[PDB]
């Protein structure tokens, strides 16, 4: 990813070091009065909110490279009581105090813009998932999630397009699709195998009817085309 | 709003005039090759989409002052096949070609931060709505929309928090009609003498708690008025 590498260089040039995190660590947390800008270079994370009673809500998933800001760039205060939890075995991130960020993102036009456009991608991402859920309900959500997986992590094999993720759980798939109970997920996963869309072999998921995912996640597919055309084009 | 008045003045300093639009007009549309930055100064709009069978989906509401960008700031290409439709009687907006926004933001850091922060408000807004829907379904969504109306247009009175929005625009915003009428039946919101009054703000806060937190974090002075 060209413009991701250009942003890495900018940060290192200015004395910002990568940091390594392991699974289950919080890169930033909902109880901290200091807010940060996170340049997630490598790894997979999820945004969570933890209620008083202890229930954990999974709000959004990110893979490197991406930018996540826990505070507003102007006020430096929280945008919401959120944690950024590492769910891959390792992740690499640059961690910048918000105040320190402004002293930098100014002197440069191009790098301001890279972060700007990432927020734009994210705004449109949530709108597309909402549109698909409004039309096709939970099937839309799950199809969109599998579509994402296929575009980002798919490899061509004779058994179909193999999702090359190792730790992927039926539960983590539901949370990533906004469905919190394994009953709904297994029901819909059942139909998908039953309609020959997905198959499970060798601990991995293989997609065999990619057109079907596109049919039920059409606005997320649109989003992929418009925001990630290079990727999208691999399988279109 | 100060950051926004200062942004209006920056646009006029660089010679951008306001345009006026009337209800049902599109400020931008999904078929235009040119993408734009809209500085919505006054009025109420909605973001719409069309599915491949002709059905219109309402995705998002915006009120002035706010910034809506139909194209990515770097590539200048569509962020999605969206239209921006006016739902108040009139709206006032500044309409800027996307490439020209880079130039303007590149030369003033104050106004770059102001636009950047409107994207941050959108992102956190959608996350809060999702959280509330995840917990209370469509009741959470509906309570949250009424809560935001209350905080934005509400005025304390002896009959409760009056919503100072004409009943016209109040109508422009199936299982929904049932939820709304149950809130009316339970006197959360009440018709009296040709206006509507929120009489149970605590109920709205209870079922849209994450959007209530969003307003507190995003607009603390407005939140504070009614709390
Ligand atoms: C599949 O649903 C979503 C929506 C869309 C969405 C659906 C329903 C109600 C919503 C209300 C407000 C905003 C989005 C909604 C977005 C999203 O980020 N995630 C999910 S699941 C987790 C997260 C993500 O995709 O990473
Ligand atoms: Na924090
Ligand atoms: Na357009």
TrEMBL record, chain A:
InterPro entries: cNMP-bd_dom_sf, HTH_CRP, RmlC-like_jellyroll, Tscrpt_reg_HTH_Crp-type_CS, WH-like_DNA-bd_sf, WH_DNA-bd_sf
BP terms from Gene Ontology: positive regulation of single-species biofilm formation on inanimate substrate
Keyword presence, tRNA processing: no
One GO molecular-function entry: DNA-binding transcription factor activity
Record keywords, A-Z: Activator, DNA-binding, Transcription, Transcription regulation
Residue ranges constituting the HTH crp-type domain according to the UniProt record: 136-211
Residues of the signal peptide: none
PROSITE patterns xref list: HTH_CRP_1, HTH_CRP_2
Stated name of the protein: PrfA
Originating organism: Listeria monocytogenes
